[PDB]
Amino acid sequence: APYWTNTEKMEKRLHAVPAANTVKFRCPAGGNPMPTMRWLKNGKEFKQEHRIGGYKVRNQHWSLIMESVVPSDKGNYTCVVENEYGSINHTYHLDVVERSPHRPILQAGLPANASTVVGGDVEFVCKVYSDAQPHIQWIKHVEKPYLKVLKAAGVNTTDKEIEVLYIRNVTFEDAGEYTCLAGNSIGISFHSAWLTVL
Amino acid sequence: NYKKPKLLYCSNGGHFLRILPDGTVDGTRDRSDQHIQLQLSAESVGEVYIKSTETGQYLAMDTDGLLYGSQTPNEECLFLERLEENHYNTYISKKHAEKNWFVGLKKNGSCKRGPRTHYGQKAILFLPLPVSSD
Numbered sequence: 001a002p003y004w005t006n007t008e009k010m011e012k013r014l015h016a017v018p019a020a021n022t023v024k025f026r027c028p029a030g031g032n033p034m035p036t037m038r039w040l041k042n043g044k045e046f047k048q049e050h051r052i053g054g055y056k057v058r059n060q061h062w063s064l065i066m067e068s069v070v071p072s073d074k075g076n077y078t079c080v081v082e083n084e085y086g087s088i089n090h091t092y093h094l095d096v097v098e099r100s101p102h103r104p105i106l107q108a109g110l111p112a113n114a115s116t117v118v119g120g121d122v123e124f125v126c127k128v129y130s131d132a133q134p135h136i137q138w139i140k141h142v143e144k145p146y147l148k149v150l151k152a153a154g155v156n157t158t159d160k161e162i163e164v165l166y167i168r169n170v171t172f173e174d175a176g177e178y179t180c181l182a183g184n185s186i187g188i189s190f191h192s193a194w195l196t197v198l
Numbered sequence: 199n200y201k202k203p204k205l206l207y208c209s210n211g212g213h214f215l216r217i218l219p220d221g222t223v224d225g226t227r228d229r230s231d232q233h234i235q236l237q238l239s240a241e242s243v244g245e246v247y248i249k250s251t252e253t254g255q256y257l258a259m260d261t262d263g264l265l266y267g268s269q270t271p272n273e274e275c276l277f278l279e280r281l282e283e284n285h286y287n288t289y290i291s292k293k294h295a296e297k298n299w300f301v302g303l304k305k306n307g308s309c310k311r312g313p314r315t316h317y318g319q320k321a322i323l324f325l326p327l328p329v330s331s332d
Contacts (some may be wrong), residue, residue, distance in 0.1 A: 009211070009305075013227060016207045016325045018285030095207075097325055099285045128200035132279055135240030154241035156271070183243040185281065 001085045002031030016095040022067035025092050027079035029062075035087075037062050040078035071096045103186035104134040111165075111180065115196040121170035124178060124193050126163050132184030138163050141177050153182075172197055203237035203251050204326040205229065208303035209286065215324070217250040223257060223265040226307045235329070238279075245292070246279045247271065261293055263311030265301075277301060286323035 004010070005028050015023050029035070037059070040046060048055040051073055055066055062081070079090035111124030128134065135154060139147035150163060167174055179192035206215035206225075213225030216234040225234075235251045249256045255267035258274030268274055276292035291299040291312065299312030302321040315321055 011227065012212045014207065014212050015209070016212070016327055017209055018325070021284070093331070095325075095327060097285070097327070099281060101281045101283070101285075130199040130201070132281055133200065133238050133240055133246055135243045152241070154239045154247065158239070184279065185244065188243070 002029060002035050002081055002083050002088050004029040004081070004088050004090070010090055013091075014093050014095060016097060017069065018097050018099065019070060021069050022065060023069060023094065024063070024065040025077060025079070026061075026063040027081060027090055029081045029088055031081075031083060031085065031088075033083055035062075035081045035083045037082070038080050039064060040080060040091075041073075042076050042078075069094075069096050071098060100131055101186060103132070103184050103188050104182050105129045106180070106182075106190045110191070111178070111193045113194050113196060115198070116170060117198060118171060119169050121167040123167075124165050126180050126182070126190075128162075132186065134182040134184055136163065136180075136182035138165065138178055138180050140179070147177075147179065170197070199326075202329060203235045204328060205234045206236065206248075207325040207327050208301075208309075208321070209323055209325065210303040210320045211305045211307060213303050213307050213309075217253065217255050217257065217267045219253050219255075221255065221267045223267060224308055225303060241276070244278060245276050246289075247275050248277070259291060259293065259299070259312065263299075263313060265310060282323070284323070286325055288322045288324055 008026055017023050053068060057064060074096055075094060077092040077094060081088040107127050110126060114122045114124065116122045137152055138150040141147040174195060175197050177192060177194050180190040181188060208225065213227060214229060214234045215225050216231055217223050218233055232252050233250045236248050237251055238246045238248050240246050247256050255269060256271060256275040258268035258272065259265055260274050273292065277289040280288040280290060282288065289301040298316040300315050300322045302309035302315045302319060304310065304321060309321060
């Protein structure tokens with residue numbers, strides 16, 4: 001009559017843990033007799049081979065750990081712990097993440113240069129992407145020597161005013177170059193925009 | 199990623215970071231609970247302010263240690279998007295650069311404090327995950 005024995009950390013149902021790491025699922029339990037065990041990743045049997053580098057087990061404090069993780073072994077993983085008198089089991093979801101500790105990637109081709117009659121006016125656009133959460137801003141080279149800033153992010157100006165410039169009654173003031181600074185800890189750089197104006 | 203509200207998993211016990219309406223902060227595991235949905239923004243390059251989407255409270259200790267949620271974007275809320283070469287992230291206080299106060303996870307779903315974190319911990323490494331079983 002089998003029984004799971006010391007909820008060590010079965011309360012750790014999830015193990016989100018970055019590529020190549022490892023990760024230890026334990027399922028002690030007990031009951032008379034020794035309960036053959038087996039394991040399941042969302043289905044019927046999972047063996048070895050279906051992973052390169054294999055598996056390696058303990059039919060000694062009966063549990064599982066494996067190691068150098070990758071995204072394709074994602075999913076729910078199930079302890080199952082049985083004798084003739086019943087069976088127990090548990091299930092662990094595994095969530096492999098993949099970071100790119102580079103600095104924000106910018107779309108090829110933005111923002112793109114444009115043109116309209118004065119009193120009219122048109123936009124240039126930036127797309128976020130995407131991990132270390134970027135802090136974002138545009139500038140323009142005027143003044144005699146440096147550029148000068150559009151207006152910040154985190155400035156209490158959200159998902160909406162996101163540079164997406166808006167240029168009301170576009171004068172020739174505005175004439176020149178526009179560029180797109182958004183950084184994290186890694187660094188920062190982007191491509192840039194001139195206005196062809198009438 | 200930029201896009202979405204995402205959740206903070208800390209590997210120690212696995213807990214997700216969640217801000218209860220009375221202002222206090224811990225984590226527990228059920229990802230149906232309503233307060234682990236966070237979306238982040240940046241006053242600047244280095245740092246981030248974290249807010250529970252549904253109840254609108256940012257995270258702010260004060261010297262305190264006492265991990266609380268503030269109503270105001272103030273000088274308590276601003277911690278560091280740390281990406282360490284082990285790919286987990288982590289977050290350490292504005293209040294200082296002094297002595298590495300960091301965001302934690304005590305193994306029991308009761309983190310606290312910042313005096314006793316540093317010296318490791320595994321209490322501190324967090325992952326941004328998506329809403330779904332994506």
